[PDB]
Amino acid sequence: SPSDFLDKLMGRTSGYDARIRPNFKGPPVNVSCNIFINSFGSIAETTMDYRVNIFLRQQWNDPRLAYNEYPDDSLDLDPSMLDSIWKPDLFFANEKGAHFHEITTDNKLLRISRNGNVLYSIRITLTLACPMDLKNFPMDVQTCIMQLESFGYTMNDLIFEWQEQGAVQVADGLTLPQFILKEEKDLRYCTKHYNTGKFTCIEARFHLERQMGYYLIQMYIPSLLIVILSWISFWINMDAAPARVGLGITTVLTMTTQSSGSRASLPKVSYVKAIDIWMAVCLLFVFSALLEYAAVNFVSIQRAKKIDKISRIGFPMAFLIFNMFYWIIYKI
Amino acid sequence: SPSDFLDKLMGRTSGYDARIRPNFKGPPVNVSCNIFINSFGSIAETTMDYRVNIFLRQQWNDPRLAYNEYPDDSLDLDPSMLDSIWKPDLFFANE
């Protein structure tokens, strides 16, 4: 009977215990496992995290579950009887908040093979926090990670591993704003040693190649437009003394409005970026416009034309020297 | 048996009670303990707090759990049977 099948598996007559690891008084348990991502993304700037939805496949051997009653090799079971059997104690190091999904059923797959190998899969939503190096923020490749880790068992009881072939899966169609998920993924061995002892760790490496399509039109073009707007200060009549003063001061306030309109979702981090120094050097060039004319105002006739001769032609040639200089260094 | 090991530790035949402090009718329990911080930080200015992730090690003595059956000195157990044994009642003041 199918009712009598679980009577020999679990329950009273079985004598099974779920509180004991498999292969007790002996070898540890290696766990071949991988993640099935669903909605990766929502990378936050200030909060410095990302909300990911995954399934978590894992496999091991529980060799005290042999049976010769029903000849089926692969055999699914009840998705709520998983609390009546042994389970690994994995968590995530920078999980920052996580929960199950009991929507209409415990979303908790449990597949038992013929010999005692167990296929297992559960659905977990995370908000993993990655320490992100943001020296060149619009051109960064951020290896934001997760770290699986056992807690209630040491390394003489439980080992985490990856899969020998295909140790990570990406569900198709996952396209992201400002991001692409790079296909090659490093899967190395972290290891935790605590005061309790040796703990097994495994981790993934998600290289986030940032798509700069937002900050070009939104940030770079308003930084580009106002700098060349400062050049028409150096072409108007010299009797425009209340007129030239109305150009540079408003536009340096506009670049201050650009600078104040550039740090909304941005975190508060100590070290300097590449996105902000472009704002500052564009702030300095529009700052550079009127003290040229204030140096003219102490001179002010053709002598003042000489100091404008440096600025009427040479200064609009004095902007591309840094723009080419910008994209060479911090492109890697 | 490992099943019979916990049968003498906890459960029906043991007679253990989790509602009683160790060293009852006598000395108190000193707790040597420390924290294992994981993600300290996120200090807020307006909210005036910080979100920290810690592990909390603590140690004490429960001297009514003597055994001579299995000669192992250090011995891990089930991470869900902790509600069946005594536990300290620590909290945090400004949590």
């Epitope: 540890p28 390394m155 003489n156 290891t191 040693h193 005061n195 040796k198 | 000669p71 000195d73 250090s74």
Partner: antibody
Framework: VQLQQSGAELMKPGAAVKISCKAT????????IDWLKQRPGHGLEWIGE????????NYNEKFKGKATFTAEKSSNTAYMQLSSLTSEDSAVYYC???????????WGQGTTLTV | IVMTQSHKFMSTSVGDRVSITCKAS??????VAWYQQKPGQSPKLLIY???TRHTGVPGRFTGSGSGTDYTLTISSVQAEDLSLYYC?????????FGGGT
Amino acid sequence: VQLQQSGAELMKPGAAVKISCKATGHTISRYWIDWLKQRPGHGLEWIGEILPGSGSTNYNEKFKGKATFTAEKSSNTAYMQLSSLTSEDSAVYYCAMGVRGNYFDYWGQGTTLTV
Amino acid sequence: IVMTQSHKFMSTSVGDRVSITCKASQDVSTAVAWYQQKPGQSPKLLIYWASTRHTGVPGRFTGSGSGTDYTLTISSVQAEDLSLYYCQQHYSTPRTFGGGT
């Protein structure tokens, strides 16, 4: 990633000396540091363990009160200090670092001490 | 907890089947390691958990055994394959080694 030690020393019976273990590659407080005693004629013999962030130890039953484990976080250096040197203590020492368990895979280079 | 070997020297012809038996004190686990030490330099891992290998050891060094018997088996012996041999148990707190070969 491999450890590093200083020059080997030479002492008289009844004395006490510290053995340093410079770490190259990472921060040594992350992982464990173990110590092994190789007296020639006989073989290797584990001494103890130290997490250099904590300094929590488990000294051996035969080596109760034998070694002293401190650490130098300013330059990633682990310290083993001995006491009461006798003729049973002329040996070769090792600062090892075994990651995936109680066994040993990373090492330094070895230091021979003679009482 | 004492690891107990059988011999202190094992020398034979080139390319033989050599088996190193080392008995523990009690049935600790299959946590059995093997250490080779060349003279003039440091020891080196051979087997851990009685079946696996260290990274960089090409073939011809296997492990087996369970319960109270554990064996390092070398069926292909070459010229550099004679040095210090040691069994190990690491299923307890005292890391106690074996007799030595």
